[PDB]
């Protein structure tokens, strides 16, 4: 992961009987703490707003995220990179329903790969996600990370605020559990918080929805 590393993330998911898959490519610089990505849905239309899944596609991998020198040994995700890890994420939206996702992240060959399966439940018409009222903007966030020896895994928690055209703000609870596929040393950190700052842009060159995405994630 040291230095510039390319990444290709492909995933598929089902929401209320609607199946859609998204594939994307980009690169991350852990030394500079920067991450650049470009996604696209092979399906004609994606039923829900993109941001509710941009968050999942972004926070599915933490290897690229930079950490301070004191926390370099503390990181668990980098330690498990050689043999990968599996994340189970539960997201409870504020009355918009629930996401249940399972992802696998691993360094295949000499390139990093992430795959995700998503299920959406408890969705009703006239909702924010159903109505596509969410704008294209995003917000920075903080994610808290804590160890768990009983499950031999790292658990993350936080709240994500998504925006609505009328201004309505949806506070959704995000919980993550990680299990290292490998049998190596975990080096699980006791407690630490990562601040994420993400900005989204579009390329007028193509008619296809671009979702050109930039992250700067720093631990503390």
């Amino acid at each position: 992961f040291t230095g510039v590393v390319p990444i290709l993330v492909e995933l598929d998911g089902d929401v209320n009987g609607h199946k859609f898959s998204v594939r994307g490519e980009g690169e991350g610089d852990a030394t500079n703490g920067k991450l650049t990505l470009k996604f696209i849905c092979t399906t004609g239309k994606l039923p829900v707003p993109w941001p509710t899944l941009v968050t999942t596609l972004t926070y599915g991998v933490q290897c690229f995220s930079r950490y301070p020198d004191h926390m370099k040994r503390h990181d668990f995700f980098k330690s498990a990179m050689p043999e990968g890890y599996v994340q189970e994420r539960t997201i409870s939206f504020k009355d918009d329903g629930t996401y249940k996702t399972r992802a696998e992240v691993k360094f295949e060959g000499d390139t990093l790969v992430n795959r995700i399966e998503l299920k959406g439940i408890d969705f009703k018409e006239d909702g924010n996600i159903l109505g596509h009222k969410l704008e294209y903007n995003f917000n920075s966030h903080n994610v808290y990370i804590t160890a768990d020896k009983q499950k031999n895994g790292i658990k993350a928690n936080f709240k994500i605020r998504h925006n609505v055209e009328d201004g309505s703000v949806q506070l959704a609870d995000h919980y993550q559990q990680n299990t290292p596929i490998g049998d190596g040393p975990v080096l699980l950190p006791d407690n630490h918080y990562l601040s994420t700052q993400s900005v989204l842009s579009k390329d007028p060159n193509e008619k296809r929805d671009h979702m050109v995405l930039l992250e700067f994630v720093t631990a503390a």
Partner: nanobody
Amino acid sequence: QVQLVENGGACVKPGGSLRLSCAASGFPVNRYSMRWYRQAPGKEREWVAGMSSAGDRSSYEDSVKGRFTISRDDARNTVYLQMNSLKPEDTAVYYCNVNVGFEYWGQGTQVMVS
């Protein structure tokens, strides 16, 4: 490049009226939505009020709906929030938010009913 400066914070006895004002610099206000969050000492931040980019409608939380009665003027490049009725729950402090490109938080001001 861009900055947000909010003022007008002052202590108010219950039943009084207070006006907060958030001004912007380095970007237009008419082309983007505006928002006002609130957080109490030692409490998680929460979105109390806000106003859509188009300005046709404004959205509040369950408790404060109808209290804030927010307003905006494009030429002034400043947004105004009116306390209207006051309750002790407003002891928490306020923050002014508008995210063009990368997200921006304003320093805001602290207001407590006492």
